[PDB]
Amino acid sequence: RCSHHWGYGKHNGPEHWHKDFPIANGERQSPVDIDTKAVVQDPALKPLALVYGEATSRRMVNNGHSFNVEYDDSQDKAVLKDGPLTGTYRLVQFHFHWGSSDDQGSEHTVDRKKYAAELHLVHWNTKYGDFGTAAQQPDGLAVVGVFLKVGDANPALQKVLDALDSIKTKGKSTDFPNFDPGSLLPNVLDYWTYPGSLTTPPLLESVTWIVLKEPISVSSQQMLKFRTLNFNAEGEPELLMLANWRPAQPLKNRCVRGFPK
């Protein structure tokens, strides 16, 4: 399996995380609020390389604090190059973070504005040989973050939202083959990038954040689904996974870059 203690409740909420996970007050935490007014540009930035071509989806798994679509990362099937990055990151999995209401639920916020859910595409630098290892380096992981705003039903975000029923509780897994990750990527790829961390315990500060300025859409009828999901596991006391996002943290002495500007 894989247990789970922390969470998004009154006692286990992101508010207390700092306890078992001290770094939650680290000098590079995520998410953060991108203050467009202060965004900066770095001539050394390039356009996002999203080589999701050969990508091959495996299964979808409810890890008890979200649901995941896992890809085969033993080869460069699909990677992420250039952008603010240097090296090659292998996409290992993607997930989302919704809220208890359409009006909030995103970890990153642009000018304090929040969206329903926020998609997270997780890649790990190959120079470290494996996800685990890479996950402990200042530049081991890189996450491409796409927003989700209430609008029209998403054909793409449905093949996903479908299978959720077959993995409603913690631990369940569905064979979700032949799904294309790019299909959840907008068509415009301007992005914001800063040095952050994972937005969940262990909260390791080894993530490069590429947050795409252009949000993709989702029909409110779809957001209701994300909530159908269960926090507990087949047999525990049914607990709905309504909220599961970390509020924005201090940027500290960091600076969010922008591309093109």
Q: How many whole angstroms separate alpha carbon 181 and alpha carbon 69?
A: 9
Evaluate the CA torsion angle 76, 79, 82, 84 in order and state its sign: negative
> Would you say 95 is a known binding-site residue?
yes
Q: Interface with Zn ion by CB under 5 A: which range of 20-28, 156-164, 197-205, 247-255?
A: 197-205
- Give 232: exposed, middle or buried? Use CB within 10 Å, 0-12, 13-18, 19+: middle
**Which residue among the candidates 4, 11, 65, 108 is catalytic per the annotation?**
65
Q: CA 238, CA 218: separation in Å to the nearest integer? A: 26
The nearest distance, CB 97 to Zn ion, in angstroms, is 6
Please state, in angstroms and rounded to a whole number, the distance separating the CA atoms of residues 105 and 256.
21
Other beta carbons within 10 angstroms of residue 221's beta carbon come to 10
Q: 126 labelled as ligand-binding?
A: no
Number of residues assigned to the chain: 261
Judged by DSSP in three states, 59 sits in strand
Q: Which residue is nearest to Zn ion (CB)?
A: 120
Which residue in this structure is represented by tokens 């642009």? 110
Query: Closest distance between Zn ion and the C-beta of residue 199, in Å?
Result: 5
Asked if 52 contacts 182 with a C-beta cutoff of 8 angstroms, the reply is yes
Determine phi and psi for 147, rounding to 5 degrees: -80, 170
55 vs 207 by CB, closer to Zn ion: 207
Between 41 and 212, CB nearer to Zn ion: 212
Q: Which is nearer to Zn ion, 114 or 120 (CB)?
A: 120
Contact region for Zn ion (CB under 5 A) — 151-159, 161-169, 191-199, 225-233? 191-199
**Shortest distance in whole angstroms from residue 120 CB to Zn ion:** 4
Question: Which residues 129-168 are close enough to bind Zn ion by CB under 5 A?
Answer: none
* Secondary structure of residue 135 in the 3-state scheme: coil
Considering the complex, state which of residue 120 and residue 170 has its C-beta at the smaller distance from Zn ion.
Answer: 120
Write out the two tokens for 192. Answer: 């914001």
Q: How far is the CB of 164 from Zn ion (least distance, A)?
A: 17
Q: Report if residue 170 touches Zn ion, rule: CB under 5 A.
A: no
Confirm whether residue 199 is marked as ligand binding. yes
CB nearer to Zn ion: give 197 or 199: 199
Tell me which residues in 101-130 interact with Zn ion (CB under 5 A).
120
Cα of first residue to Cα of last residue in the chain, in angstroms, is 44
Identify whether 123 is a catalytic site residue. Answer: no
Annotated binding-site residue? 97: yes
200 labeled part of a ligand binding site? yes
Q: Cβ 139 to Zn ion, closest distance in Å?
A: 18
Q: Could you write out the DSSP letters of every residue in 205-232?
A: S-EEEEEESS-EEE-HHHHHHHHHSBSS
Q: Are 34 and 251 in contact (CB under 8 A)?
A: no
**Residues with a known catalytic role:** 65
Residue ranges of the annotated binding site for substrate are 199-200
Residue ranges of the annotated binding site are 95, 97, 120, 199-200
Give the footprint of Zn ion on this chain (CB under 5 A).
120, 199
